Amino acid sequence: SNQAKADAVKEAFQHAWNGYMKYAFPHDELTPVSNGHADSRNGWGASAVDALSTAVIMGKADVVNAILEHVADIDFSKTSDTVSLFETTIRYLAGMLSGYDLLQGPAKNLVDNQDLIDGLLDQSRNLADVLKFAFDTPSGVPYNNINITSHGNDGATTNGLAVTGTLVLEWTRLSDLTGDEEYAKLSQKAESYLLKPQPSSSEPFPGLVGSSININDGQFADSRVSWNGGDDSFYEYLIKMYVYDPKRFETYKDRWVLAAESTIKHLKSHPKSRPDLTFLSSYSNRNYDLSSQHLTCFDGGSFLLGGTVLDRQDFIDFGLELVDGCEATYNSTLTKIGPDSWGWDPKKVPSDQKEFYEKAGFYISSGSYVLRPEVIESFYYAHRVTGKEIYRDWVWNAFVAINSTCRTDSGFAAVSDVNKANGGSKYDNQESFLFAEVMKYSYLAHSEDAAWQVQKGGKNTFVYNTEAHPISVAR
Ligand SMILES: *[C@@H]1O[C@H](CO)[C@@H](O[C@H]2O[C@H](CO)[C@@H](O[C@@H]3O[C@H](CO[C@H]4O[C@H](CO)[C@@H](O)[C@H](O)[C@@H]4O)[C@@H](O)[C@H](O[C@H]4O[C@H](CO)[C@@H](O)[C@H](O)[C@@H]4O)[C@@H]3O)[C@H](O)[C@H]2NC(C)=O)[C@H](O)[C@H]1NC(C)=O
Ligand SMILES: *[C@@H]1O[C@H](CO)[C@@H](O[C@@H]2O[C@H](CO)[C@@H](O)[C@H](O)[C@H]2NC(C)=O)[C@H](O)[C@H]1NC(C)=O
Ligand SMILES: *[C@@H]1O[C@H](CO)[C@@H](O[C@@H]2O[C@H](CO)[C@@H](O)[C@H](O)[C@H]2NC(C)=O)[C@H](O)[C@H]1NC(C)=O
Ligand SMILES: CO[C@H]1O[C@H](CO)[C@@H](O)[C@H](O)[C@@H]1O[C@H]1OC[C@@H](O)[C@H](O)[C@@H]1O
Numbered sequence: 001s002n003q004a005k006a007d008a009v010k011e012a013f014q015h016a017w018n019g020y021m022k023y024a025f026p027h028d029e030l031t032p033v034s035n036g037h038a039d040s041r042n043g044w045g046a047s048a049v050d051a052l053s054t055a056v057i058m059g060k061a062d063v064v065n066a067i068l069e070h071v072a073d074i075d076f077s078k079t080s081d082t083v084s085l086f087e088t089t090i091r092y093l094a095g096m097l098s099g100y101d102l103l104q105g106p107a108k109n110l111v112d113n114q115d116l117i118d119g120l121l122d123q124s125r126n127l128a129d130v131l132k133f134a135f136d137t138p139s140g141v142p143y144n145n146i147n148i149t150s151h152g153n154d155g156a157t158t159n160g161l162a163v164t165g166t167l168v169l170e171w172t173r174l175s176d177l178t179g180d181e182e183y184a185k186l187s188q189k190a191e192s193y194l195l196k197p198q199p200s201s202s203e204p205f206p207g208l209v210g211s212s213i214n215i216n217d218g219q220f221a222d223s224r225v226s227w228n229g230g231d232d233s234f235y236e237y238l239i240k241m242y243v244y245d246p247k248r249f250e251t252y253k254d255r256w257v258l259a260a261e262s263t264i265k266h267l268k269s270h271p272k273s274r275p276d277l278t279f280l281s282s283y284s285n286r287n288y289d290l291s292s293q294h295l296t297c298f299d300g301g302s303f304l305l306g307g308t309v310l311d312r313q314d315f316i317d318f319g320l321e322l323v324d325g326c327e328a329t330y331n332s333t334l335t336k337i338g339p340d341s342w343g344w345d346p347k348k349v350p351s352d353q354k355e356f357y358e359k360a361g362f363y364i365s366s367g368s369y370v371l372r373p374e375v376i377e378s379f380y381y382a383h384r385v386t387g388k389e390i391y392r393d394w395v396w397n398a399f400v401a402i403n404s405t406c407r408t409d410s411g412f413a414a415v416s417d418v419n420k421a422n423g424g425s426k427y428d429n430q431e432s433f434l435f436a437e438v439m440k441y442s443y444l445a446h447s448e449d450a451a452w453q454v455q456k457g458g459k460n461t462f463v464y465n466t467e468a469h470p471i472s473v474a475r
């Protein structure tokens with residue numbers, strides 16, 4: 001059963017790789033409907049670099065070698081577009097480092113190209129040296145949007161919470177591997193202002209903080225709290241940094257615990273029509289916004305990871321409740337794939353979605369699905385933490401619906417409406433995380449145990465970055 005399902009995920013990954021190689025490589029991505037190419041990530045070949053960790057884990061040597069040869073020719077000092085410090089760090093930097101850790105460790109006998117493997121660290125070092133000026137600010141909090149040729153930026157006065165707090169794993173791993181502590185120092189200095197938030201009005205509940213930080217002095221600029229896009233991964237990385245090295249980052253763990261408890265006490269929310277469902281709300285100056293995003297569903301997985309690592313059953317229980325809410329948004333639509341955004345405010349239910357809200361527990365705000373991985377990700381952690389078969393089955397059901405609804409002759413496409421036959425209309429877009437995250441979590445849910453799988457308690461020897469790239473844990 002499981003070997004056949006695993007082989008089926010490898011087939012769908014191969015399908016998209018063949019199309020990408022055929023019509024777009026070395027550009028950043030395949031345009032799956034017109035069978036063409038696009039470059040949304042600076043032209044360095046994002047889909048190829050994001051696919052490396054997944055191909056190694058699946059044991060596809062031919063795909064691995066092709067990517068290793070490509071990395072060697074990249075020139076990270078040149079590009080015709082502005083550069084995102086956040087996106088460049090989580091996809092390219094983490095993708096090369098993960099490949100290096102996997103090929104230097106658990107998969108050391110998959111290929112013979114030691115010089116090309118060694119070059120994965122060389123190019124990671126090269127990439128950070130081109131990006132580091134972003135941190136050379138008064139406070140140390142970086143400008144996320146920069147011009148790597150001029151060294152200029154977009155003129156912003158504040159940097160977002162997630163884009164500021166989702167860098168420490170990759171940049172610190174680079175120092176540990178190289179020996180040059182500069183990378184860890186820069187990223188940890190930026191993180192410092194988030195662990196000891198000021199002014200206190202910016203931290204409404206213990207551990208839950210505002211959404212923007214002033215670049216000149218490190219003080220927060222607002223008091224809006226949420227686990228949605230723009231905020232999410234800051235909380236994700238607090239507990240993950242503890243798994244990376246519990247000695248060095250015990251402080252990060254303490255701050256996550258406060259965030260987890262405050263979230264269970266204040267942001268938890270049950271729809272009036274379906275009290276047995278749980279979603280997280282957002283908060284701003286005493287008012288609760290009753291809506292969420294597909295992005296937010298990484299939440300169940302975080303509570304499950306922190307819960308098993310800290311032997312806290314109440315965190316494991318809450319993570320499963322969030323996992324059930326997200327599975328409800330998926331299994332309530334016609335395609336069996338969930339919406340990008342939704343709501344449950346009893347006072348704002350759309351007249352045309354009345355019957356639906358009443359039975360499902362929510363009304364849809366945006367019905368598109370852009371090949372996102374967060375729901376399958378949290379189902380994957382639920383399976384690894386509890387060992388229960390139902391969560392594996394939910395990963396399989398979601399994978400089959402994506403393969404039936406989104407597949408084209410060359411790859412997979414984003415769709416406009418998950419509650420209409422065939423997804424409504426396909427968008428000419430295939431993001432690189434299709435390769436890095438959707439295909440990897442779907443395969444791991446069905447594949448053999450190994451050091452790269454997520455583990456229980458204090459047994460993890462690898463920790464996943466926010467783009468599903470596993471990093472070897474410290475020392
Ligand atoms: C479409 O999505 C649905 C929504 O996610 C999904 O529904 C179910 O999903 C879960 C299936 O496992 C289910 O969760 C379980 O519920 C068990 C029963 O709980 C009920 O009764 C107790 C009474 O004491 C109440 O406390 C609960 O609130 C609830 O009313 C529960 O026993 C179980 O917990 C055990 O197992 C977990 C590990 O799985 C352990 O950690 C725990 O200690 C227990 O041993 C778990 O909570 C969920 O309740 C249910 N959702 C709803 C609202 O219906 C559908 O399955 C899905 N449909 C399809 C086609 O896939
Ligand atoms: C990044 O900044 C560089 C400046 O160093 C911009 O390139 C210059 O653009 C001007 C305006 O068209 C040209 O006249 C110069 O010849 C360019 N200089 C060089 C050496 O290329 C570039 O446009 C900026 N990039 C982005 C994405 O805005
Ligand atoms: C994912 O989609 C592919 C393409 O539709 C499925 O493969 C096809 O399956 C049919 C049987 O229904 C065969 O007749 C075709 O020859 C297959 N085509 C190819 C290119 O292999 C595949 O079965 C789907 N995967 C899962 C797990 O459902
Ligand atoms: C635009 O959304 C992405 O970037 C935001 C920051 O501007 C993040 O807060 C948000 O989580 C999101 O990042 C995920 O996007 C999909 C994949 O690249 C990864 O899973 C990112 O975590």
Ligand SMILES: [Ca+2]
Pocket residue numbers: 298466467
């Ligand atoms: Ca993520």
